[PDB]
Write an enzyme that holds these catalytic residues in place. Structure first.
Site, PDB file in Angstrom:
ATOM      1  N   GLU A 155       0.824  -1.197   0.000  1.00 16.56           N
ATOM      2  CA  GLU A 155       0.000   0.000   0.000  1.00 16.56           C
ATOM      3  C   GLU A 155       0.863   1.254   0.000  1.00 16.56           C
ATOM      4  OE1 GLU A 155      -2.456  -0.587   3.520  1.00 16.56           O
ATOM      5  OE2 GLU A 155      -3.785  -1.866   2.310  1.00 16.56           O
TER       6      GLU A 155
HETATM    7  N1  LIG Z   1       1.324  -5.822   3.425  1.00 15.35           N
HETATM    8  C1  LIG Z   1       1.621  -4.575   4.149  1.00 15.35           C
HETATM    9  C2  LIG Z   1       3.094  -4.126   3.906  1.00 15.35           C
HETATM   10  C3  LIG Z   1       4.133  -5.215   3.851  1.00 15.35           C
HETATM   11  C4  LIG Z   1       4.671  -5.865   2.790  1.00 15.35           C
HETATM   12  N2  LIG Z   1       5.757  -6.558   3.253  1.00 15.35           N
HETATM   13  C5  LIG Z   1       5.881  -6.361   4.547  1.00 15.35           C
HETATM   14  N3  LIG Z   1       4.907  -5.557   4.935  1.00 15.35           N
HETATM   15  C6  LIG Z   1       0.822  -3.445   3.514  1.00 15.35           C
HETATM   16  O1  LIG Z   1       0.894  -3.258   2.293  1.00 15.35           O
HETATM   17  O2  LIG Z   1      -0.114  -2.728   4.207  1.00 15.35           O
HETATM   18  C7  LIG Z   1       0.109  -2.391   5.610  1.00 15.35           C
END
Ligand SMILES: *N[C@@H](Cc1c[nH]c[nH+]1)C(=O)OC
Ligand SMILES: *N[C@@H](Cc1c[nH]c[nH+]1)C(=O)OC
Ligand SMILES: *N[C@@H](Cc1c[nH]c[nH+]1)C(=O)OC
Ligand SMILES: *N[C@@H](Cc1c[nH]c[nH+]1)C(=O)OC
Ligand SMILES: *N[C@@H](Cc1c[nH]c[nH+]1)C(=O)OC
Ligand SMILES: *N[C@@H](Cc1c[nH]c[nH+]1)C(=O)OC
Lengths: 81, 229, 229, 81, 81, 229, 229, 81, 81, 229, 81, 229
Positions: free
Chosen positions: L116
């Protein structure tokens, strides 16, 4: 014991715990924890002065026997054969 | 029935009785595989149950009042007239019952087996009854090996015990043979907890009858041949 | 069987019948502790069950189709020939059954007990049968006090009821005595919910049979002695 | 009731709820909620014209009795003694 | 099947799964998953040379029958009627 | 028994046998609603169970060793002397048993029913026995419709099967009729998982016996009338 | 943060590292009760986790893909320009993180505590950083005793560790400090089973890291100071 | 350990079992067996060449750190403070 | 209360029981009985003499606040927004 | 945030405080539906929690050591130099926090809402702070009605409370606003049991704070305005 | 799907059922049936006329966004990163 | 972030949108394994969620009031003065957010990933913003492949979507990006039952969005590009 280890791999467990205070419970009763059972050997005989009731005579005698030695007095006995 | 992959026997698998390791065979019965199955007197196992359940006056971990206990049970009823000569068909002087547990060599494949027997005694001599009883072991062992034959289930040892009562004139007798299937309460398990189920069983497996008795503060009801059936 | 620490009886513990509080004793049987155990007619309790389960044509909360209901049951079968003179050994004219519930004074220590009886009637006079039946209560109460003796279980009241049928020539009769052990469905519990288990039981405990009937929109099947067994 | 309070302290409960619509279920059947049971009293008799089948005659008569008064018609009756 | 859909709306389900390897288990045994059951039909007969023990003769014969054809050999048979 | 809203029958509801759809009626019995209830030979259903449980030498998904299997069972025992003329009261030459399953038209209201029968054979001609047996179907169907009458339960079909054995002199026979109530193991369900309970049942519902056999790598034990009871 | 009555720490409570018993204190911080709290280097505990979870190329019992792992975590982000002189407000050369576990003397009353810290390094000399870090232990131990003061929670030992990275020009760094709260898979427990939950934990409690490694057939990833953070 | 014995008497248990193959799971996830948890210590740092996206730069760096040394790569990290 | 009756018909229940002695537990923790939760209002402030550690200063102050008035001392606080 | 169909608030739904029924509105805020939402001082609700959790020195049913408590929380941190004139950007003299609970008119459709606020105080006069605080209620109520507008959720009453501390020179302050979501222990429920879950909640619903206090043998910590935040 | 079959063999299942009427529930909430979860994508923006309260302005705007398009209005949002 | 072995995505795994199979790639990003990862516009997936949860005025299967929904969320806040020239440091004209889902090629080994992003827009031209946004996909895809690199997780497709709002003078904007993790209610599953959990999931897997809509009697909220973010 080492046997249980083999049993467990089959999905079998000899765990049989009663959630009550002091008393034991029967295999399959709800609330018991585990999927196993424990058993024992009981042989006893009881008597009663004959009455004109064959049934009642059996009941009482079959009650003096349940209460003699190993106690299983007020039990609902189900039969397995 | 039978007791198999899901069970243990009081006095053998848990709360083992010293009398069990010390017990000497009475004789042997040949099995389908050619092995000789030793036959013992089930007194050690009988007394054990009394030690756990307790007696009517000295109650311990007996079944819950009104509980449903499934039992591999059998029994026999017989009447004895007021000294009448014509004793009718199925009447008698005494009534007896027996219970036999046979432990499988491989409890992961074959189930241990219970074989129960019961009958009426027609002669008035109790001493003569005992002879018959000692002879029943042979009859039962025979059936045991036969049943094993049916399922190709080899046992390592078999324990047989008896019970009886002789009726007074105009009295009826009921001889029962029963093997209850229960679950153990926490306060009978030293250092046990409802949150440690499997450990609980192991505790009971590791404690010998005397050790349990002492750890519980229970006197020995079997004492020294103090129990008779 | 017995009914103890885990149970309630329909018409007594839950859905109590007004007939119960109004019922007068038939007589009393002496117990091991010297107290006199009042014996009543179990008609109020018998009708109650009919009110809950409903009847074959007016079905209510009967057991599920194909369900497994464990019952403290007993029964007797007897044949009546086509007016033949030689009625053989165990045949007869009528067949009867009885059921007796004895409530423990201390339900936390002692279990309530069920004693059941059944037998064949050899004379052709139904009116004569009723006499025998009234006489059975004595026989049963006798065994009741005897059983209490065995476990030192004192009861406060006992309720005994009977059932019977007289066979036509060449007809066979079956008289059964049964006490079912069930669990209650939500739609039989006014203001009950699957999410409020214990409250559910309390609701039933607080509702008297008529209150329940009215709250449910059920007519009274026991009406005014409308039920006969 | 105040009795249940004492019972609970022992680990016992008289809760017996059936998850079905309308119907009751037997003690110990899976899906039931609670570790207790409810019971009642039923005595009834039924008849059947004799046939050459003692067994079948017992079956039917023992079925007319189950269906008479308090209905327990199509039930698998297990015996407790 | 479409029948189950109707059954589910009543709070009934015919699911009956055994958590063991290979073996089936009996209805109501702890550990089984679901609140239903599966059944079948078995009729068989067995024999044994008569001995002076009516009981034992029944036992064995009633064992050769359990082990004949459809196997239900070392089972604790409970009776429903 | 009965099998109702909670069950399926091996060979009919799951692992359906082709022999079932091909089976032609033996006759019909009139029901309370005027409909004619077709009666079939339960051989297809009998063989089916053998295919699932397997045999003593070719074991498959048989019940767990020492498990508790509740069964709608019945049975009969009879003795045959060493050619003695005086055969006493209840003895005989052969012993037989029967089992009948009747499927309800509306399984959501009425339960399917099991009616079992058993008896002794007094004549020495096995061929004559078979006649009697074919005659029992009539007797059982009669009771069936009678029981339906009691609960106003209409069936769509009924399947009746028999078993028997003829004793040699000085031999005792035991004919049993049993309907077990079990739960299925995952390794008997192709593509099944402990995590997909309901789907598991559907798989078994969709697989016909041969399809299951093949998918499991099991030979057909029922082969071509290879099984006899 | 905290870990209390419901937890164990990898390398201390289960899979204990030999380095833990051999570890000598760096210094001590005074607690509210006047006792001196020994401060150690959390390297043994840090390596331990690597041994269990495994690494990106040598994966072991790491968290399930997509699982939700709650972590007592904190972190810091900082940028380092392309050698620019004006480094703006919160930018820097290096970024660091720290984690500290303090074990309670009485785990039944007081919970163990995690105190985490993180910050940016403004000077370009890595060697100078290490000095600051060694100095943070003092700062952290100070807050530790202060927090214990708040809940009157006395600790017996505390373990503090650090992590850092120095950015290249035009690079951003992220230093994180995290303590995951997980549940252990069966295949990581020698002789463990899903049917023996509590025993499983005891096995892990009894196995030292090397014993586990060997019993599992895992090489030691911490080897001899092979891991750097 | 002897500590657990005291804990159990309070209704607390440190049992934390994962039903998956190989992988660990987080405290509170459904399917886990037990009401306890296991923890550990992890401190690591990661980097990334600056882009015009502060957020994305944080994401990646905070991913290289999760994948460095003790692996907790594709985890949904929830925060406790 | 009469509100729960309406809630229950939706499949919702405000039952929230902790199996421990004395202590409360957080919503969603395993072992808790029920699918509901109980809440309350807590507002408090704590101080600490400034050090050269912004983080640590926050930690302690945010600890003297948790321990002031309503005690929630050694809690793993998860955030809902 | 929110607390809805699954929850109750301590001091309002369970353990209700007498101060709640006696409390008079401070003012009202107009809602989307035209109804006027009364605004009260949340002191009664604040004190209530203290009565249940207890204090650091007089601990009652506080959260378990090391437990995970999800909280609708927020907070603010601020520093106050050693009397320095240049107070930098976000520093200040005092720090404050607030919490507001708004109960929905129809808890079966709309969820009750928590709105929290926090901020720094720039002037040195505490007395002047209180004025600002009294003015925040207006600001918060405004946002409340606005949020209700978003979901068309009408509330019946709203309770807002505050907390604050003024820093000494060279001191840092942390003002937090938190709403914990917990589950209640049995020993805090008079006549409660682990076997009677739903009843347990009802007990708490029926007991007023004083009644609970007395029934538990707890002194009143809120006494007479004895608690200050 | 065929993927689930593979997943099941690992002890994983993507089953995620809510016991309520109409409403969905969050992963890990008690009462939910299954050990899996379902997700989706939501991106939205909301506004509010500035006030002297940075916090409150965030709250409302972050509420108009939750209520815009895909509704997640009165939800207790927990953060995973 | 992540969604892995335990999840499905609305619009892709269940309630698949036709727009998904018809969607053509915008471009591709190179992955560590040399494969080209197609990048799509996540509009189909965005609309899908709206179809299931429903809108504020046309509510469907939205989360329970007061429920706890864990979300992989992020967001950004920004202010826009009343046309003031000095916009201070972090203020702006518009605010935007983005969400990207990347599906793994082997969901049994690697987890799918959510990335995101969010930020402020400094120029007043909305049309110019759109350009930037189309440019962000490149930025995000870059980070995506970079993250894959870290875990050696290859994806097969990635879907990125945006949201934004432009503030009026003296207005504050909040752009959020959130991925909720929920469990589905029975009345949203055609032919589903609480007793058939796994089947329920399969139903949703097999139903396409339109099919579900129609089967539910729901109009299409996404209609024809009727939804804008
Ligand atoms: N999925 C989480 C971010 C992420 C990706 N890899 C480790 N953390 C996100 O996109 O939203 C909080
Ligand atoms: N175990 C039963 C009898 C048995 C043995 N084989 C089949 N059935 C018993 O001894 O007690 C009822
Ligand atoms: N309760 C049983 C008989 C009983 C009483 N004591 C032991 N057994 C009964 O009355 O019905 C079968
Ligand atoms: N199903 C039982 C008999 C039955 C039928 N109706 C009542 N009881 C059976 O056939 O086997 C025991
Ligand atoms: N344990 C938390 C911090 C903490 C200590 N006391 C209250 N909060 C931590 O160190 O990591 C987030
Ligand atoms: N309830 C949360 C804020 C909230 C209100 N609407 C959406 N979010 C709170 O007050 O504490 C974090």
């Amino acid at each position: 014991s080492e046997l249980d280890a083999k049993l467990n791999k089959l999905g079998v467990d000899r765990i049989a715990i009663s959630p009550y205070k002091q008393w034991t419970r029967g295999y399959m009763e709800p609330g018991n924890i585990g999927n196993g059972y424990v058993t024992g050997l009981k042989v006893d005989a009881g008597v009663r002065d004959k009455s004109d009731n064959n049934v009642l005579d059996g009941i009482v005698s079959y009650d003096r026997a349940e209460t003699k030695n190993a106690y299983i007095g007020q039990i609902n006995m189900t039969t397995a054969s | 029935x039978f007791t198999g992959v899901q069970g243990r026997v009081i006095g053998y698998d848990i709360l083992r009785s010293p009398e069990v390791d010390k017990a000497k065979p009475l004789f042997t019965e040949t099995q389908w595989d050619g092995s000789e199955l030793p036959i013992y007197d089930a007194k050690p196992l009988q007394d054990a149950l009394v030690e756990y359940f307790g007696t009517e006056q000295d109650r311990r971990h007996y079944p819950a009042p009104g509980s449903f206990i499934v039992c591999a049970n059998k029994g026999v009823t017989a009447e004895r007239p007021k000294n009448d000569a014509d004793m009718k068909p199925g009447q008698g002087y005494g009534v007896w019952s027996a219970i036999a547990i046979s432990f499988a060599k491989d409890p992961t494949k074959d189930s241990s087996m219970f074989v129960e027997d019961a009958g009426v005694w027609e002669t008035p001599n109790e001493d003569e009854l005992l002879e018959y009883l000692e002879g029943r072991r042979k009859a039962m062992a025979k059936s045991i090996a036969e049943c094993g034959q049916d399922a190709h289930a080899s046992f390592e040892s078999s324990w047989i015990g008896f019970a009886y009562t002789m009726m007074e004139p105009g009295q009826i007798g009921n001889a029962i043979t029963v093997a209850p299937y229960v679950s153990l309460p926490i306060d009978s398990i030293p250092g046990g907890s409802i949150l440690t189920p499997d450990k609980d069983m192991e505790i009971m497996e590791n404690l010998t009858m005397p050790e349990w008795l002492e750890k519980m503060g229970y006197k020995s009801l079997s004492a020294n041949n103090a129990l008779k059936y």
